[PDB]
Amino acid sequence: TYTIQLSGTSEGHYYEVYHIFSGTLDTSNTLTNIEWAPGVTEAGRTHFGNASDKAASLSGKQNDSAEVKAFAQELNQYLSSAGVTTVQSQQGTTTISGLKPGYYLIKDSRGSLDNKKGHAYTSFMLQVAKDTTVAVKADVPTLTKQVRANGSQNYTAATDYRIGQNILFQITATLPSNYADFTRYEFTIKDTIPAGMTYNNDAQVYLQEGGTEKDISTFFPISYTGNVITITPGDLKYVQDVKVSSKIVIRYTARLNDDAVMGGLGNPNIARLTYSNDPNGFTSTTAETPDTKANVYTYQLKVNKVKENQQALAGAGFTLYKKVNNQYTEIKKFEADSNSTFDFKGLDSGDYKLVESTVPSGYNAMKDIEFTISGTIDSTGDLTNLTATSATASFETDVNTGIITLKVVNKQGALLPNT
């Protein structure tokens, strides 16, 4: 008995091995005394005619020959569980022991990958039973979503922006190594925008070959409903320029809006790819890729205006400036009234100046506060830390609310005695 090692497998699959021909494998390594084995039905035997004559017409044909592919495809409709072995797939290499000599058809068990994500059916594989290693004829496309980092031109899992700033997003689809074995290729990217973000209706689709992009947008009508971007050409084979080494790249912009989440779990957009997962014949099963997720955080500065007894002081106004290329630019002003709490929603990492642009009557002007907001965003895309620092002042921060608190204590002017 013989042992096929099936390399490049993942967990998740039940691989079925059908005994097509029995025979004796001689000192020569040809197969002799060939008969139909229990893995083919009587109907199939009758259809294909004499077993040894069929083996003869296949003898010395190439491994990827049209003859072997037609046999494997045409066999499938005549298979029997009378001569089936079934194996559970290991991560890396799947070992199939105890094979009597002869010729086996290997396939994924039908339906065995429905509803499961990131998997694909193998092209039906005809293999002679030797102690051999062969690569499984199965691949899956992949989907990566990233956000262009704050002023870095670099794509990342997550970053921080300010509300109203346009943000560039990128989704990259790779194609499976057996792309050519499909006659039709269903391709649908759905990208869910969070309530905290507004899409700019500007998605474009690019074919990326080695280092060169080509706008293929005209093939992909794009719809936006329910905060869901759908991108699909119906059949990706409509795009004839597409090779197996091609990337499909989607780019669009979105911007944080007033409903943005502060700190915490941020404002995530989640994409998945629905793809043709069965290269065998006239089929229209699909799987989805596992989710791919990008994230944009934003923070809030809460300024509290009080006097030395810590109760509220009305009548202050504040202007906040951000350093944009060493040029403090005004981003938010509050005019003065009864309010003592100033909530600057939608700040990112950067250098800020707070100016008390209106002083309550009877009180000294606060000195300007130059401060720095630093969100820690790891490669996962978790906001793990939020800090605000100033030479001149002291902040509270809570990463989970995204709130930076500054309590501004107002000192009374002097009521000076007169000799």
Next chain:
Amino acid sequence: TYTIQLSGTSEGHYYEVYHIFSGTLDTSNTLTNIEWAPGVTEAGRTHFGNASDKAASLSGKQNDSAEVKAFAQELNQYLSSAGVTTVQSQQGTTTISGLKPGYYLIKDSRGSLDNKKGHAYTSFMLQVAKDTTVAVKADVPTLTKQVRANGSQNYTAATDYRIGQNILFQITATLPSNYADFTRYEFTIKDTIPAGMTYNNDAQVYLQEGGTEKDISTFFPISYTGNVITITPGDLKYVQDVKVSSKIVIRYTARLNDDAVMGGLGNPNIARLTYSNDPNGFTSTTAETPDTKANVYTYQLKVNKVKENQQALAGAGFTLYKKVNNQYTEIKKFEADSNSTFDFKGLDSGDYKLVESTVPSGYNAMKDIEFTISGTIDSTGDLTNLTATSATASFETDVNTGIITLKVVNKQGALLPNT
């Protein structure tokens, strides 16, 4: 030498005591051998004539008579600091020592009260120097502002409401004990509405004579510009029904809006009254009362949807109900998509139910959470504490941000084996 005690005083004043007549006070309470003292100028002495004969025309006249009033008024243009004693006012009773016998005019020092709030100039007082107590002829109006409490129907310095709920406010003006001593009485209430509150343009003005109210709105044209309600009749004497014992009452509603401050210093409104502060002749000076403040706080529930590894779970939706009349009523619903953070803005103290009205695919429904929000607002009107409790769940709260956090951990369903 004699000591007048001047009762009903506050700190802040410099009372000037002008020696008008010198003479001898006998065992009997009569003044004899009357001469002009140094407190009167030679121009006055000429105008009023013989001192003893002027004293004689005033002899026996009533304490509140027209003749004494007119003398005190016409004296004022002829005063000299050659015969002036000046005394700083104590809280309650101001002692004025070392008075040589005779007749004194007592007044607030000219301009003495112009930068100070909550004070009023006394009627010129003519007084015979005895060892006696006389009440100062000065009072001030008061202005009190309060808010009708959450479902309590009585008024208080501060309470909590939900965003969009109409809130009843009340401003009460008392008039000074010497209201009738004014010929004209400027009366202007300014009420500053915070950014986070919206005025319903429904202020009405009521006269209160004990426990009976009368709509006097028609006399008070009201304006609202800059989030400031201005209520003024120009002259309160135009409202002839208004007596010294009357209360003027302003009532209006406002509601919290989307810009509401959460927890912390809350959403205060500040009112002050501008009033005629000098009963002495043809004058148009005013003082403002000290600021009076009411406050409405509101809170925010933040629900984080996660799975057992504490990473965000997309695709949940939540409905929040408040118990209004032993009747859970829907106040806010979020639909499902990529968001994992549910910010329920604008909640008050009360009984709530959080229902996971949409369950992420492959996770068990959260069981409903009945919970209680309780903001502690003390007699001052400080939000000192904020708590959320449930038999079924645990919350985080921060009184400063007004944020109540619930982390909802989703458990996966069972992927059941099939024989």
